[PDB]
Amino acid sequence: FDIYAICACCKVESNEVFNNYTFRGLGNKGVLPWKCNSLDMKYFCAVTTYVNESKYEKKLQNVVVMGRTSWESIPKKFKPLSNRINVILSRTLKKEDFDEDVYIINKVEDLIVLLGKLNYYKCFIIGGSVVYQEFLEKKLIKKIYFTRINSTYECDVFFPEINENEYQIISVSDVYTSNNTTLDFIIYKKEEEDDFVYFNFNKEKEEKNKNSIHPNDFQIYNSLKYKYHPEYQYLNIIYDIMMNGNKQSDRTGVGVLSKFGYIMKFDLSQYFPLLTTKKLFLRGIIEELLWFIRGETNGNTLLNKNVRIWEANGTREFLDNRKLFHREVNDLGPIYGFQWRHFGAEYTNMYDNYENKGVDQLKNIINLIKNDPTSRRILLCAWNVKDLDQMALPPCHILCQFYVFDGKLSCIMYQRSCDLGLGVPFNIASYSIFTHMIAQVCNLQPAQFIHVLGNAHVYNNHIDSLKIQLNRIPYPFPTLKLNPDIKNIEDFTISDFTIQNYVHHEKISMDM
Amino acid sequence: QVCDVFDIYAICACCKVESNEVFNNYTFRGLGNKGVLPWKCNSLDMKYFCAVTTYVNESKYEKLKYKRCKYKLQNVVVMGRTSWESIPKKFKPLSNRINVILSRTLKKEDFDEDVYIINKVEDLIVLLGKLNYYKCFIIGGSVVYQEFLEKKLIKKIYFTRINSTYECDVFFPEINENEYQIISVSDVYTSNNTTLDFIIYKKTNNDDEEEDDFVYFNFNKEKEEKNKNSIHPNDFQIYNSLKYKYHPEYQYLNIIYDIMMNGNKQSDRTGVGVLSKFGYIMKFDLSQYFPLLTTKKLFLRGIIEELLWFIRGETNGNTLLNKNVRIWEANGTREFLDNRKLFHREVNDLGPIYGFQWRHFGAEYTNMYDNYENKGVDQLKNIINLIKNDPTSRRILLCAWNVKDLDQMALPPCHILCQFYVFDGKLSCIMYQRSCDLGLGVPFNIASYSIFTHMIAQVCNLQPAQFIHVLGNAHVYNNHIDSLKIQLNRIPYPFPTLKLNPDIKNIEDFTISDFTIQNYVHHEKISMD
């Protein structure tokens, strides 16, 4: 045969449980719910008007089976769909009641009777509330090329549920922005080569591939053919460490799997990389970032806002094993906050007015982005080697470095100690926000947030949790709204931060 | 052409022979000495030799059985008779292979299995038109290799380069560049105390639905190829002509290509002009080689004195100038210190740079003559005590970027930090470089921190594993383009080895003589202008 569908589906207007079905809304008043989508249009056009030279025998053009439902909706300029063999499932009207150089049908089976008689490459099913429906009910559809507009609109029609048992995903594209929404494209479904083998003559065998994880558990992960969604930069590092990672016991007498040296790149112009295979929260961490800009080392400011990210490191007992016997509870010492605004100054306590003592890097980096964008000395370093001893712990995040090309701002953050299961997910969120923040106050469009992992580890009792995680297919990323009016780094407040269209899988306890 | 039909291939291993130096592929030719191998065993050369000559793919047979007609599956090894008698007997005949011997002085009627016996080339064709075999490998020795190539009967060659020198009496014959081009070069390994690599030469011309989707998911790609920077990739014939570029130098070369083809056009401070990208990782296995670029000449005396200088804690430019190392000469002149607003700084007093920070971070810099005794943090001593006593720590860092001192320094550090990592008494090292001159600087910086990782690894009684290099601002200078183009069409030679003098057990106690770069084989020096 060679029959395929191809839909575009947004989310429907009326705690929320998201699932594949979330994305159903197909039409609103005989048109799309969204007024236009350039990138979706282009994808659909490239898909439906591509033909491979060879692959026939086993010009040459594709079929596009729409219905009266759909056909009529299309303007006259595009019609009859450029470079395609159009077809129209209408009971109502015959070839006598239409203009263009089309073919008609009436029954579902009268497509079989037309197709067995025709020259083509591939057969695409373009649209119809019911034109998808009865095609699934009559197991006729091989793959579904399915676009997810990751925003919410009013609709009157849907796309029918999809049987987990009948159809499964085998490809997830890169995530894009276009027409002020994110979207991605997925696929549902029912002599110099032996040279490769010779060059692999020295790798692991079959039971030497270090670690006692299982294939059987990663059924759905190992299945996916193209893993181009950028959440897979995180997921494949979980998969690299799990399978190839060195077993170490640490300081505490616990147990991790560790590798050394990874780099993730996230394009903030196209999405906000808030991992989608588990629920994440950003109030906790946006408030940590504001606390940093304000220059605080005061455990209490965060505790009183029920941000407990540092509670553990402020206790009488934790400071005392650092040898900080002269340190008030929740006085974390010269940490992120102090080093950013007062680097070099002598630290006294967390209450002291430090104004105009030390190096205000944050101001410096910002003036350098504005004054000298082509500089290669735009670093923000929290690892003061004089003050490490004095900190409740040394910075986990060593440095941000900045790059400006064509009014556009990228950011590498180098991390010395990466807990892949809990921390990294938040860490990717934090320095992403900061990059938007610095971009806005510097009149620049965010480009890539770039994350270098040093000691990258997965804790032994996060593993069953992460297996569950690897086997969940990423949803399209959300977007981050910064209040456009804010234009100094100190003038930001929690309410200037909005996450739009966060579609996500169920919460997971990395634990127990 | 006869050999395409019967898939007849050559496989060989060649060392460098007993006699500045010129180096071509004709450097590697040494085949055998006194009817044995010039090296004792290799082992990995053996394992590679075993895997290839015994590798069979039973699906891809039928296409080749069809092809041969028109003109437990096993390969055929073809062998001169003295190469046969070099084989140690407990290994005769070569297991899981059809052994063919080539002799005039011996026949069928005096072996004991051991083989098929033939007495002529066009006599092997007889057998291959008759036999059930996958591919046919010609394993030598010299007299065989020779008569097989001058007959245009070899379709490719699986040439191992044994990057050491041994006594030789039989050689592989000069390959002609016109008849054979290298399509593929492999990872470098260390085996029985030599670097070695694997290269393929090729005879020149002088569910399959997982296929469309790629094209689809590729819809929004920028390049149909209105080439994004004015580089004509038809100037990189050889670079693009290689199928498998697995040599670890291709990690440096590949970045030059990524920057050349994809860089952002920027101009700097002085106006000089660059193409830039942000953020690369290179990893090198120091256990398997020493990553000193082979696509041009590099001297290490300068960068080694510098590293010893840093460890001594010095900041005196004179000390290096008095050893004819001019690295920091430009950064210490009245002129340069003056534009830095360091008018109260003596010429060649460069200030609180690498040496100072490693030995005395957070001390107040006075001058290059102040001995700063027990003043500021001795980081280097700290990282050496952390690796010995605290290897599981994720806090074993050394940082040269002291925000407080940046303006007092002749220039800010390019090598922000090193972080060490210790699994199973092996020591990996990561270095973050804020700014990266790919054409001039990064080559030395690769060798510089690889050299340091070895030094730590020795004084902490550990073996060196990975040198990991993180690039941030990665830029090729517009003047380095032509030269880097030339360099990209040179095929890397196997990396040399670095031997430190093993009596050194203190980081303080290394001296220029305690450092030996053995078997540096390389293309000729390129001026980047």
Ligand SMILES: NC(=O)C1=CN([C@@H]2O[C@H](COP(=O)(O)OP(=O)(O)OC[C@H]3O[C@@H](n4cnc5c(N)ncnc54)[C@H](OP(=O)(O)O)[C@@H]3O)[C@@H](O)[C@H]2O)C=CC1
């Ligand atoms: N580096 C590497 O990869 C390899 C190294 N070697 C080394 O090479 C050396 C052996 O090579 P070399 O000295 O050239 O000897 P060969 O292995 O090439 O054998 C030569 C002998 O093979 C027979 N022979 C060769 N060609 C023909 C022909 N066309 N027709 C009939 N008989 C033929 C003759 O045997 P007869 O005397 O009975 O007439 C001849 O004397 C050793 O030192 C060995 O270790 C060997 C192979 C691979």
Ligand SMILES: c1ccc2c(c1)COC21CCNCC1
């Ligand atoms: C009729 C049929 C199909 C379409 C339209 C009308 C409008 O845009 C699409 C093509 C692009 N994907 C979305 C749907």
Ligand SMILES: c1ccc2c(c1)COC21CCNCC1
């Ligand atoms: C006969 C034929 C070939 C060989 C030998 C004997 C000894 O080992 C080699 C194969 C591996 N490279 C070295 C040469």
